[PDB]
């Protein structure tokens, strides 16, 4: 066959395993037949171009559908009352009741109500008409075409880059820090000053107007005279109606701090100043590394030079330059870990400090965004650790990393893993024990016997940031502190107004329930890290299989020889860490959603009192809030939440189906499929038809992967349905 | 011929014709010597 053109070992397989493995190994270029390093890098480059084109097309489709089937123009008028519609529904299976139930948003045809917040985002950017969205979609289609053409072009013989170019670290770092990050944020500041702020103040600025419309009455004279403070005078009044000129100011750059009163989001002038400042900072950072001129550093020199003279790190960072530059998996792991941390930060900061107008009052949108980004963060962290393990298996060179930090990590992997296991057991034992203690005492009717620990440390941090709810009087809660006196006339007034009002999610009040769930989150993070770190460090070998690197990253097992070797691979460590990562993110999003739901309905006491025992979570969060969702459709009718109820049950179904693959293993199914093949061959009128690929049972690793995928899809879809439907049915 | 007809014209295509043709062509490709 020539299906897996990249593997004759698969092309010559006479079973369906060929098709399955050709699917699952299509993007492992390193393992493909006759793969050279140059071809590997050039294919990755072209694939990146295609991926960027896909992203541009996806955003273009969002914009186009919101422009065509959306209600953006009538949403920009009363954004707090109009529901934003994502796209129209055309399903030939809907009944008239379903069409009527889904006809909402002020439109006259069934629609989906967006939970992505793109409406608020674009409104804040400066989009007001559907023509603006359509023009944006056109531009993104053009950009997708440009990037597809670039990907095709850079695969041509005279345009294919070389490896001396792919491994040029200094120039890439300089350009990414200065232009991709720095100048890009500077351009975003330029946009926010030329379009977003005038649009927020009711003055339309576009391509036909921006070359004649001054962003500031003084023009650029304050900039070119050094009187930069003139750009902060006359900010927007507290009675500014976003999108109109009533209450507007003339400032373009400020540091008011806090939130705009009406929109309840960060000041657009503050955002513009933020982006300008980080832009110049990044432009400066991008001039650090040496390029075709004499100035700059060399990363190899810095790494080799950095070795503490005490010798507690050995050779320090010698050889890491070559290791990282020659290992794409090391780079992939670093990038994935950093992006995962940044997306968690995006989630954590975007709910505490909303940046888009009126987004804070779109409760379902906020919960959906937070859950989305936390799940993405967990996926990225699991991927970072998996690719670290793959690097250890494939790209690690001990002789090169003779007694540097990496070799030392491998040296005391036993200590690392044992201490990680100890801290995991510590956290688990005691967190679960406190939860069970509270459960039992409350069950016996003695809630006063609960062990409720005040998160005094987090409360102290809040008070330091300026929260007066708790009496600590530390740094910014203290009016006579140096910290207060330093920023009293820049941002502290607004920041204190924001922090000390209970209208926002900025530094929500915390209690013993928060303490307990936080230590549950700590347990989850530590156990996921335990599994992933153990997989990465034992990937090359263990006492059971001291030659694992020979077998690779994702082999099934080593047989029942030494007492059993099931799940003895780093891939299997990843497979288990994915259950644990799904468990931890579930805990995190449960905590977030319940706290915010209780605050939104104003009964924060319900969380404060029921979060201390697991029956409280099971009853007052899941059981209590599942009512509208499970009533989406019922014997007496249906509403728009019927789709979410259906997806809820869909997630349950696929989750339980994944249980099949995870519990039942191959031999049973292989002996069953044998009988099935016998039956087909000896059935008249059906033996006229014959399989071209011998029907076989799924492989061990394949079954693990399929069960994991089913489990993950059930997890994600069930919680998406629950969160969105419950939020939409309660508010 | 307005844009309102495009959903009814396309959804059956994208949901039954494109998948059917893709599946048939992919089948022919994967089972081919």
């Amino acid at each position: 066959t020539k299906f897996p053109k990249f593997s004759q070992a698969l092309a010559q397989d006479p079973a369906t395993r060929r098709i399955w493995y050709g699917l699952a190994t299509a993007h492992d270029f390193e393992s493909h037949d006759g793969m050279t390093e140059e071809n590997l890098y050039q294919k990755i480059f072209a694939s990146h171009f295609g991926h960027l084109a896909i992203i541009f097309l996806w955003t273009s489709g969002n914009l186009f559908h919101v422009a065509w089937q959306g209600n953006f123009e009538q949403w920009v008028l009363n954004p707090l009352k109009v529901k934003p519609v994502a796209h129209a529904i055309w399903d030939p299976h809907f009944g008239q009741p379903a069409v009527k139930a889904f006809t909402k948003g002020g439109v006259f045809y069934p629609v989906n109500i967006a939970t992505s917040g793109v409406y608020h985002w674009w409104y804040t950017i400066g989009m007001r008409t559907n023509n603006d969205l359509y023009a944006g979609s056109l531009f993104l289609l053009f950009l997708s075409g440009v990037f597809l053409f670039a990907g095709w072009l850079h695969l041509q013989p005279k345009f294919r880059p070389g490896l001396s170019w792919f491994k040029n670290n200094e120039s890439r770092l300089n350009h990414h820090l200065s232009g991709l990050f720095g100048f890009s944020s500077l351009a975003w500041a330029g946009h926010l000053i030329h379009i977003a702020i005038p649009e927020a103040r009711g003055q339309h600025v576009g391509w036909d107007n921006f070359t004649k419309t001054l962003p500031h009455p003084a023009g650029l004279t304050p900039f070119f005279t050094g009187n930069w403070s003139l750009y902060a005078d006359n900010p927007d009044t507290a009675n500014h109606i976003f999108g109109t000129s009533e209450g507007s100011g003339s400032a373009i750059l400020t540091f008011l701090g806090g939130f705009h009163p009406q929109t309840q989001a960060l000041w657009l002038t503050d955002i513009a100043h933020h982006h300008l400042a980080i832009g110049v900072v990044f432009i400066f950072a991008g001039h650090m590394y040496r390029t075709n001129w004499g100035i700059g550093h060399s990363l190899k020199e810095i790494l080799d030079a950095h070795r503490p003279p005490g010798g507690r790190l050995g050779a320090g960072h010698k050889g890491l330059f070559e290791t990282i530059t020659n290992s794409l998996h090391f780079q992939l792991g670093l990038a994935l870990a950093s992006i995962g941390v940044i997306t968690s930060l995006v989630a954590q900061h975007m709910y505490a400090l909303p940046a888009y107008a009126f987004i804070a009052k779109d409760y379902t949108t906020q919960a959906a965004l937070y859950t989305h980004h936390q799940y993405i963060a967990g996926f990225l962290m699991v991927g970072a650790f998996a690719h670290g393990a793959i690097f250890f298996v494939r790209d690690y060179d001990p002789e090169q990393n003779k007694n540097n930090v990496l070799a030392r990590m491998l040296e005391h992997k036993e200590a690392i893993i044992s201490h990680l296991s100890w801290v995991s057991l510590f956290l688990g034992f005691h967190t679960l024990g406190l939860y069970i203690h509270n459960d039992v005492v409350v069950a016996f009717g003695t809630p006063e016997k609960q062990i409720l620990v005040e998160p005094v440390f987090a409360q102290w941090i809040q008070a330091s940031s300026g929260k007066a709810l708790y009496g600590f009087d530390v740094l910014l809660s203290s009016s006579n502190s140096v910290a207060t006196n330093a920023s009293n006339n820049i941002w502290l007034p607004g920041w204190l107004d924001a922090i000390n009002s209970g209208k926002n999610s900025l530094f929500l009040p915390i209690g013993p329930g928060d303490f307990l769930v936080h230590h549950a989150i700590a347990l989850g993070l530590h156990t996921t890290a335990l599994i992933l770190v153990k997989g990465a460090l034992d990937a090359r070998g263990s006492k059971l299989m001291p030659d694992k690197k020979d077998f690779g990253y994702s082999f099934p097992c080593d047989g029942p020889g030494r007492g059993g070797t099931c799940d003895i691979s780093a891939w299997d460590a990843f497979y288990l860490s994915m259950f644990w990562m799904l468990n931890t993110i579930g805990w995190v999003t449960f905590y977030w959603h319940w706290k915010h739901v209780t605050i939104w309905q104003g009964n924060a006491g319900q969380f404060n009192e029921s979060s201390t025992y697991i029956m409280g979570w099971l009853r007052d969060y899941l059981w209590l809030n599942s009512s509208p969702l499970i009533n989406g459709y019922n014997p007496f009718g249906m509403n728009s939440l019927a789709v979410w109820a259906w997806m809820f049950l869909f997630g349950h179904l696929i989750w339980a189906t994944g249980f099949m693959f995870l519990i039942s293993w191959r031999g049973y199914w292989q002996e069953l499929i044998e009988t099935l093949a016998w039956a087909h061959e000896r059935t008249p009128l059906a033996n006229l038809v014959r399989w071209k690929d011998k029907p076989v049972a799924l492989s061990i690793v394949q079954a693990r992967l399929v069960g994991l995928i089913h489990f993950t899809v059930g997890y994600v879809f069930t919680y998406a349905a629950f969160v969105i439907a419950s939020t939409t049915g309660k508010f | 011929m307005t844009a309102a007809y495009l959903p009814s014209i396309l959804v059956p295509l994208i949901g039954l014709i494109f998948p059917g043709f893709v599946m048939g062509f992919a089948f022919i490709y994967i089972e081919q010597e």
């Binding site: 294919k43 072209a46 694939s47 171009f49 295609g50 084109a53 097309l57 186009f64 422009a67 065509w68 123009e73 008409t129 559907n130 023509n131 359509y134 979609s137 056109l138 289609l141 053009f142 997708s144 075409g145 597809l148 053409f149 990907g151 095709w152 695969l155 041509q156 | 011929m1 307005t2 844009a3 495009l6």
Partner: peptide
């Protein structure tokens, strides 16, 4: 508010992008 001519221009750009995507897919498959 979005006219059929606008939708047709969008469709033409989408078709151009599809042609370029097929070209890139071929080049990558090689």
């Amino acid at each position: 508010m979005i006219s059929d001519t606008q939708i047709f221009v969008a469709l033409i750009l989408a078709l151009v992008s599809l042609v370029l995507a097929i070209r890139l897919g071929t080049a990558l498959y090689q």
